[PDB]
Ligand binder design. Structure first.
Ligand SMILES: [Fe+3]
Length: 308
């Protein structure tokens, strides 16, 4: 039986954990928490941790754990299962990316069309969009978006974007509220995460929604994908079962269980989402280094300096 420290959404974790038990007979116990809290706890526990596997919504928490020497190598065969072009790869082969979530632009298709849309996320934070673009400054995904912009285009561009959103954007408390405002006719478009919209569409039928999705693509900062993944703890006294769980997550069946429970992009090339997501490769996600905590603190300074 194994212990999984779980930073991912509980419906995702529960659903892969149950398909695991069904396929192998091995019981999974989840210890859930925020990924950053869990990584800290895994570093304090060190070689005395009870964790066998760390399952996270964000692969960036792996870099420090790897560098601290706390992750076990994963099979090369397993790593190759999700190693599409653009997918982050552990240089020490000691964690694996499993699924992604994308930034998108949701729009009311009865007020705007694909041809009104912009080639860059940078273009939405300008006067042509005054009163017409929703954003959510308090979101974890928003913070990540800032970091990527800072890294790809430098700090002056990121700050200019944030100032533009302040001047021109409609601020919403959460991604789901932003979507509702677009559906309700309050704002014709917003910046959100893909899965809020696919969830609504799965539930309602696309033909009954005013809103549609525009993906920026061509490796723009607004095509940013954030990746979930897993690692085996080097200190686990149950390596065999831990490695079997991680291989299962990379397997066709494990990936099929994830995408049944949650509208993330599978990273296996032979699995299709029941939410009707495009193939990962069509996203043309940019290549961006991992978000450190210093990166997150930096983005918060830019958000503050912008009056947000
Ligand atoms: Fe959320």
């Amino acid at each position: 039986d194994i212990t999984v420290y779980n930073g991912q959404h509980k419906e995702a974790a529960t659903a892969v954990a149950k398909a695991f038990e069904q396929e192998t007979g091995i019981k999974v116990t989840l210890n859930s928490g925020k990924s950053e809290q869990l990584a800290g706890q895994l570093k304090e526990e060190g070689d005395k941790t009870p964790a066998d596997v760390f399952y996270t919504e964000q692969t960036a928490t792996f870099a420090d754990l790897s560098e601290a020497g706390l992750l076990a190598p994963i099979s090369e065969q397993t790593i190759q299962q999700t190693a599409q072009k653009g997918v982050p790869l552990a240089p020490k082969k000691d964690w694996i990316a499993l699924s992604g979530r994308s930034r998108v632009v949701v729009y009311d298709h009865t007020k705007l069309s694909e041809k009104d849309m912009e080639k860059s996320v940078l273009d939405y934070a300008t006067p042509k969009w005054k009163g017409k673009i929703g954003y959510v400054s308090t979101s974890g995904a928003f913070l990540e978006q800032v970091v990527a912009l800072s890294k790809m285009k430098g700090d002056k561009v990121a700050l200019n974007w944030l100032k533009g959103l302040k001047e021109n954007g409609k601020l919403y408390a959460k991604n789901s509220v932003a979507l509702q405002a677009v559906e309700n006719g309050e704002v014709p478009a917003a910046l959100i995460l893909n899965y809020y919209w696919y969830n609504l569409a799965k539930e309602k039928g696309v033909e009954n929604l005013k809103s549609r999705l525009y993906f920026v693509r061509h490796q723009d900062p607004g095509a940013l994908v954030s990746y979930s993944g897993a690692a085996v703890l080097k200190a686990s006294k149950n390596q065999a079962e831990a490695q079997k769980f991680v291989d299962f997550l990379a397997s066709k069946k494990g990936q099929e269980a994830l995408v049944a429970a949650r509208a993330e992009y599978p990273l296996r090339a032979d699995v299709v989402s029941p939410f009707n997501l495009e193939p990962y490769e069509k996203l043309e996600a940019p290549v961006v280094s991992a978000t450190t905590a210093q990166d997150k603190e930096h983005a918060i300074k830019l958000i503050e300096e912008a009056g947000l």
